Paper text:
In this work, we describe Format Chain Exchange (FORCE) as a high-throughput technology that enables efficient combinatorial generation of bispecific antibodies in different configurations for “screening in final format”. The dummy associates with the knob or hole Fc of the productive side (covalently linked by hinge interchain disulfides) and thereby covers the CH3 interface.
The implemented changes include reverting in CH3 Cys354 and Cys349 (KiH interchain disulfide) back to the parent residues Ser354 and Tyr 349 on dummy knob and dummy hole, respectively. Thus, Fc-dummy heterodimers are flawed in that region because Cys354 and Cys349 on the productive sides are loose ends, not paired with their respective Cys counterparts as they are missing in dummy chains. Additional mutations introduced into the CH3 interface are charge-flip mutations between Glu and Lys at position 357 and 370 of the knob or hole dummies. These residues constitute an interchain salt bridge in regular CH3. Figure 2 shows the positions of these mutations in crystal structures of the resulting partially flawed Fc interfaces. Limited reduction of hinge disulfides initiates an exchange reaction between complementary educts driven by their partially destabilized interfaces.
Author numbering:
A (entry chain B), B (entry chain A): 237 to 444
């Protein structure tokens, strides 16, 4: 029988009005037999009609894969609406239903703090700048660095970590050339989270 | 039939000579029809005979659980020797063999940096002290906080994060009363890792 995998939007997509959050319903192991696949979509049990389904695509294992994509309204996802994908196929005993929704829990607003390099590390070639984000809930969050109007990619961010008070924290470490910090370039940590005003805050850091 | 799980020593136990590192071989789903389990232990393929096996213990699913514990020599573990557990049971077609050893790879020394709280934060009643540990390999590590020789264990530490040069980093966040910080008490981050001199370093942090 076919199997169904239901995927959520990316957090950043739900937090920025100009992005396009989508829920993706993927069906695999569709037979030659019985290649017809029907999608029904429901939001809080109410059927919706505007999903965009793709033609089936045969895989190297001689089975078909078919994807239906539902664009969601940012505020619907953030308000906890439940998205159900129902998949019908003649080779199935009964239609398969999957339902997905945003992580639950009372939201808590992240506090964001930039931390300059240790004075030990000024003799290293590069320095590490630190963006600590603490006290947030739920754990879905996006953290990004930039400078002079361009993204700075040479960073890594820890997973969210459950703190003692039940909130999450993480740290993002941006590595830059020392000269470039000496220089006095300003670096900025952008944080996107449902519990922030405008779902966005930025903190900047430069040599003092 | 039964399942076997093989667990390494704690990092701290392998790194401090006074402590006692053990490898633990756990057998679950030992049924009453076949309750007798044989453990054969090997170090680099050579059988050793000093493991201690402890009385089988009856779980709430009525099945059993038998545990053998092998004491390891610190330098054997650190030099990459392989520890093999072989579990023999009547119910089992052939004995199950599990092998474990230290995480492989060329060691790299942790760089340890303490970062004071952000000024932003001085308005709460608690402050966050950070201990940034970067550039280390393998990921086995222990990170602890103390003040005046005593454990401060009101802290949380991120998991190791694979960094863009293939080494690891993490942060440990210690939360303390603002008063303790304001009054100048000294706090210390201690790190234990195989690539450190004496497997140990400490870095302290205080207000001017
Ligand atoms: C026949 O072949 C098919 C097709 O496979 C391909 O072709 C074959 C011939 C080989 O060449 C394969 O190597 C090829 O890939 C096989 O189909 C596979 O079946 C698996 C089940 O049997 C299924 O496993 C499940 O995978 C889930 C994760 O899927 C993610 O991540 C993987 C990488 O790990 C990636 O390959 C998948 O495509 C999928 O990727 C995500 O897709 C979603 C939807 O597009 C993305 O979300 C969207 O992203 C956009 C932006 O891009 C936007 O934000 C939207 O808002 C958002 O919705 C998402 O970004 C992608 N992520 C990544 C990282 O890429 C697992 O979660 C799942 O686990 C669950 O179930 C397990 C049991 O099955 C449990 O153990 C577990 O606990 C979980 O509950 C499964 O592991 C494969 O995904 C599926 N492959 C594809 C391509 O569909 C088929 O199996 C095979 N049949 C036979 C008989 O051999
Ligand atoms: C009947 O019941 C038993 C017992 O069930 C428990 O008790 C009952 C009363 C209920 O409460 C249950 O809910 C309880 O679980 C069932 O036994 C279980 O079988 C599972 C297999 O089906 C097995 O899953 C595997 O777990 C591995 C990790 O186990 C860790 O962590 C869990 C907690 O997350 C813990 O339950 C285990 O005890 C074990 O804990 C470690 O123990 C070692 C050994 O002592 C510790 O290491 C030693 O510690 C000492 C100090 O204590 C000292 O430091 C030594 O130096 C050191 O050696 C270690 O500290 C403990 N770690 C932690 C984190 O606690 C997984 O890794 C494994 O995954 C692997 O396989 C997967 C696929 O199978 C893969 O995804 C993956 O990649 C891995 O390869 C499995 O998931 C359960 O552990 C096991 N539970 C116990 C207690 O043994 C039994 O199955 C059930 N029967 C039936 C029919 O259901």
């Amino acid at each position: 029988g076919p199997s169904v995998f239901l995927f959520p939007p990316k957090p950043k997509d739900t937090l920025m009005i100009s992005r396009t959050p989508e829920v993706t319903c993927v069906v695999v192991d569709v037979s030659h037999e019985d290649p017809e696949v029907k999608f029904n979509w429901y939001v809080d049990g109410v059927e919706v009609h505007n999903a965009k389904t793709k033609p089936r695509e045969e895989q190297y294992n001689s089975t078909y894969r078919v994807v239906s994509v539902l664009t969601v309204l940012h505020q619907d996802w953030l308000n906890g609406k439940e998205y159900k994908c129902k998949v019908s196929n003649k080779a199935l005993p009964a239609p398969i239903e999957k339902t997905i929704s945003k992580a639950k829990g009372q939201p808590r607003e992240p506090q964001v703090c930039t931390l300059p390099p240790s004075r030990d590390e000024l003799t290293k070639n590069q320095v590490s700048l630190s963006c600590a984000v603490k006290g947030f809930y739920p754990s879905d969050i996006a953290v990004e660095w930039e400078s002079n109007g361009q993204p700075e990619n040479n960073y890594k961010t820890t997973p969210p970590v459950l703190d003692s008070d039940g909130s999450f924290f993480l740290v993002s470490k941006l590595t830059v050339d020392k000269s470039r910090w000496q220089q006095g370039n300003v670096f900025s940590c952008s944080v996107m989270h449902e519990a922030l005003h405008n779902h966005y805050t930025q903190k900047s850091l430069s040599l003092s």
